[PDB]
């Protein structure tokens, strides 16, 4: 390589750490019943929910 | 106009003038995969590819 001035590559300074967050509730989704419901709907009038 | 009538300037002027020219456009650089790629692993690899 002969003398001047050359852009090898980026400098993309990598993370030291991780942060997740989310909204401060415990609630759960009624879904088992929904996939288990022997009272089920019908399809030409479905529910949702 | 006619063959024996010239006509002849006795008082002068200056009239300083501009004149502007372009020498440099903004000299910019684009980083290759920074630009393209979100700095990412699988879509750097597709990248190179």
Same mark, same amino acid.
């Given at each position: 390589?002969?003398? #001047? !001035?050359?852009?090898?590559?980026?400098? *993309?300074?990598? +993370?030291?750490?991780?942060?997740?967050?989310? +909204?401060? !509730?415990?609630? %759960?989704? +009624?879904?088992?019943?929904?996939?288990?419901?022997? *009272?089920?709907?019908?399809?030409?009038?479905?529910?949702?929910? | 106009?006619?063959?024996?009538?010239?006509?002849? +300037?006795?008082?002068?002027?200056?009239?300083?003038?501009?004149?502007?020219?372009?020498?440099?456009?903004?000299?910019?650089?684009?980083?290759?995969?920074?630009?393209?790629? #979100?700095?990412?692993?699988?879509?750097?690899?597709? %990248?190179?590819?």
């Amino acid at each position: 390589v002969e003398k #001047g !001035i050359y852009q090898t590559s980026n400098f *993309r300074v990598q +993370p030291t750490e991780s942060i997740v967050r989310f +909204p401060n !509730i415990t609630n %759960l989704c +009624p879904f088992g019943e929904v996939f288990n419901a022997t *009272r089920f709907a019908s399809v030409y009038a479905w529910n949702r929910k | 106009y006619s063959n024996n009538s010239i006509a002849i +300037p006795t008082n002068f002027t200056i009239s300083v003038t501009t004149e502007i020219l372009p020498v440099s456009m903004t000299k910019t650089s684009v980083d290759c995969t920074m630009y393209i790629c #979100g700095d990412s692993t699988e879509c750097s690899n597709l %990248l190179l590819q």
